[PDB]
Amino acid sequence: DIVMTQSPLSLSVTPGEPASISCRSSQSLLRRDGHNDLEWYLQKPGQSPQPLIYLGSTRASGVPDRFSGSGSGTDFTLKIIRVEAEDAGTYYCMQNKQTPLTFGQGTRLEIKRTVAAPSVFIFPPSDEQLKSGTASVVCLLNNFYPREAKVQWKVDNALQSGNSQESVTEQDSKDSTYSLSSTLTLSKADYEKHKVYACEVTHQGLSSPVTKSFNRGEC
Amino acid sequence: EVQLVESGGGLVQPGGSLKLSCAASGFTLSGSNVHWVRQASGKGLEWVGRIKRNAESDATAYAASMRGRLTISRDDSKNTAFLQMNSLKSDDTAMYYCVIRGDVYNRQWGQGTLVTVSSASPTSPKVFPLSLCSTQPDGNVVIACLVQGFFPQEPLSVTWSESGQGVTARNFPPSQDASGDLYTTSSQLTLPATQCLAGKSVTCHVKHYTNPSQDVTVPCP
Ligand SMILES: [Cl-]
Ligand SMILES: [Cl-]
Ligand SMILES: [Cl-]
Ligand SMILES: [Cl-]
Ligand SMILES: [Cl-]
């Protein structure tokens, strides 16, 4: 099979500035007609890959002029001359010289910007949920950059583990910030034995942690 | 709109069989070789197999790791191609795409369908209105819905009954619960305070899997 490799595996670019991604193939993809059996895609999370370039350099239908493919043989480059927010996602090169069709690893482009500290919001379990036997406490972080952020849950000052989960949005179209949802899930029985629920956030942009808390039954 | 529409996925028992359909909508599939490609959540793209046009006697080819367990077929009269999978295993769980090749008139990927090889039945999310207990941000109001304990993790989407100027909805990907094998997420809406006064409510609408959608009222504070 043909092995496709990309470099870098991630990059951060500010809007208006150029990005490039390199792709290498283990076999030459050069065609008799001078084109190459090489295609580039952009994939946004959960969505089908979108064709950007095929035949090495042919820009696909409706693809913006800022995307260009170049190279020949075993070495190829995707250039985005002026990065825009909507260009964030994972880029793949792919050979179609033979089956099995093979893809590179994927390069995640994110939009660079200045540091932004998260705002933090805490929500107690709904009364409706409590009646079914489960208690979820939710801590939402908004408007932060870079993507790394740490949530610590405390119940009466005891650090929690093995009972929470989190996920993070893609970057906001307008300000390129991330948001994060952390959920602490306890049984109703355990939840009602304790008083102080706290989510403590730390981040590059925070000079001190931000802790949002509530006393059970006071919301 | 012209596109490739997939169906026939979802949950399937280990050892079970599932036939995916790839139906052309607004173009003719006959001129293309039809390929199948899959992607496990958070992972890369992997070719599954192909079928050539009838002109080439519909010749098939399969990925090494699934060869003995696949039949790709096509029905040009229905403008549809099929991926029959058999003896499915946990490691076949993935989002499956069909892809057309070889037709200068048409280049299309299907929207993808998630195949989950599991002994579990589906579980609809339990959707709850949330009320902020910390402070509201200057000028705006935050409300949210908890979307708890669902399976499989996709498809899942949430929309709100307010949108437009000054309104931002945040939708977080599903994550696996710390115990119990289900998934949970939330959806948040931030809107001008004047647009979410006491006595006003907003609804979150939650779609999941192939079951009926849910609509939950979320009171403004
Ligand atoms: Cl190509
Ligand atoms: Cl452009
Ligand atoms: Cl900065
Ligand atoms: Cl998956
Ligand atoms: Cl394509």
Side-chain angles (χ1 to χ4, degrees), chain A residues 1-31 33-173 175-219, chain B residues 2-53 55 58-221:
Chain A
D1 303 359
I2 298 175
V3 179
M4 305 301 291
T5 56
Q6 299 178 208
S7 170
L9 305 180
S10 69
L11 71 174
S12 173
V13 181
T14 70
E17 293 311 310
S20 77
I21 300 169
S22 291
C23 174
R24 286 210 191 87
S25 173
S26 61
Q27 288 286 323
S28 172
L29 304 181
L30 181 63
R31 300 160 50 87
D33 67 11
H35 286 310
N36 292 264
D37 290 321
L38 187 286
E39 177 163 355
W40 288 97
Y41 300 87
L42 165 62
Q43 186 180 34
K44 304 197 183 177
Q47 184 178 305
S48 70
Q50 313 168 258
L52 300 168
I53 304 292
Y54 49 81
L55 287 164
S57 62
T58 300
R59 189 187 287 111
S61 298
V63 171
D65 178 72
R66 62 184 179 281
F67 295 94
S68 287
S70 61
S72 188
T74 60
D75 281 274
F76 300 91
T77 305
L78 180 68
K79 296 182 183 196
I80 308 174
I81 189 182
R82 286 167 289 273
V83 165
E84 299 184 15
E86 64 165 18
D87 297 339
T90 299
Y91 290 79
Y92 292 91
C93 64
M94 181 264 299
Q95 64 79 24
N96 70 301
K97 180 174 176 71
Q98 75 164 6
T99 51
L101 304 179
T102 54
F103 298 78
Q105 301 96 319
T107 295
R108 179 172 176 272
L109 173 68
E110 65 126 37
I111 311 303
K112 180 67 172 182
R113 55 151 289 157
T114 59
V115 172
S119 53
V120 183
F121 300 97
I122 193 169
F123 303 79
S126 68
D127 284 337
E128 182 188 346
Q129 186 189 29
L130 289 173
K131 291 181 163 67
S132 67
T134 298
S136 290
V137 194
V138 178
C139 189
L140 300 184
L141 286 54
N142 292 355
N143 294 131
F144 66 88
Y145 183 88
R147 183 183 196 182
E148 291 78 25
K150 182 182 189 49
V151 176
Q152 296 174 261
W153 282 101
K154 290 177 225 173
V155 175
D156 297 315
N157 271 331
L159 180 72
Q160 304 298 113
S161 63
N163 56 6
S164 64
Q165 63 201 114
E166 63 172 42
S167 57
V168 180
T169 66
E170 293 301 288
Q171 286 174 286
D172 183 89
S173 57
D175 73 7
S176 300
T177 60
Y178 291 102
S179 301
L180 179 153
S181 172
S182 181
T183 305
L184 172 76
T185 297
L186 303 179
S187 65
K188 155 125 147 53
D190 289 343
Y191 174 76
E192 304 201 339
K193 296 174 183 56
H194 293 281
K195 179 174 174 170
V196 184
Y197 288 84
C199 76
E200 179 186 341
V201 175
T202 50
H203 183 263
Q204 165 67 20
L206 290 172
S207 286
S208 312
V210 170
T211 303
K212 294 301 174 79
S213 311
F214 67 87
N215 295 331
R216 180 189 40 76
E218 291 191 1
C219 306
Chain B
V2 179
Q3 62 197 114
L4 271 175
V5 177
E6 299 178 52
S7 57
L11 282 161
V12 56
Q13 287 276 340
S17 295
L18 208 58
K19 189 173 196 183
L20 305 184
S21 290
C22 179
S25 180
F27 77 99
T28 60
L29 190 70
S30 186
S32 288
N33 301 326
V34 180
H35 295 246
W36 291 86
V37 171
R38 70 182 181 180
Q39 184 173 220
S41 186
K43 303 191 193 171
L45 290 150
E46 184 179 39
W47 187 79
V48 170
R50 64 93 167 120
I51 184 164
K52 292 190 176 295
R53 295 171 291 260
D58 279 19
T60 45
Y62 305 124
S65 82
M66 304 168 63
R67 208 168 31 218
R69 292 179 293 137
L70 291 183
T71 306
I72 296 171
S73 59
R74 61 195 302 154
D75 182 344
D76 288 339
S77 80
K78 298 188 180 173
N79 216 205
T80 301
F82 305 96
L83 176 63
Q84 178 78 64
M85 304 190 288
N86 300 310
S87 305
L88 285 159
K89 307 162 52 172
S90 307
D91 73 356
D92 295 315
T93 293
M95 179 129 311
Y96 287 74
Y97 299 98
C98 58
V99 186
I100 61 175
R101 281 267 172 290
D103 181 7
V104 294
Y105 291 98
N106 298 286
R107 178 173 298 265
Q108 299 283 344
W109 283 62
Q111 91 279 13
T113 186
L114 184 62
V115 167
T116 302
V117 188
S118 168
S119 64
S121 57
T123 301
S124 294
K126 304 97 189 184
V127 183
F128 304 105
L130 302 187
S131 191
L132 186 68
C133 69
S134 51
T135 58
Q136 291 290 356
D138 178 54
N140 290 306
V141 160
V142 172
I143 57 193
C145 280
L146 178 67
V147 181
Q148 200 280 328
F150 54 97
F151 186 88
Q153 68 173 306
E154 295 287 347
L156 181 78
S157 67
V158 184
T159 65
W160 291 84
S161 64
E162 300 280 339
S163 56
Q165 209 161 219
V167 178
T168 307
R170 290 163 165 90
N171 295 106
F172 307 90
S175 67
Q176 194 176 341
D177 297 350
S179 63
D181 304 303
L182 307 176
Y183 289 76
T184 295
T185 191
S186 65
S187 187
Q188 181 192 347
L189 194 65
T190 301
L191 60 179
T194 58
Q195 185 158 169
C196 208
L197 252 292
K200 171 87 176 298
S201 256
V202 74
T203 63
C204 65
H205 187 261
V206 178
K207 301 182 68 178
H208 170 74
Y209 198 56
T210 48
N211 298 317
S213 302
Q214 297 182 68
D215 183 322
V216 170
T217 300
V218 188
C220 291

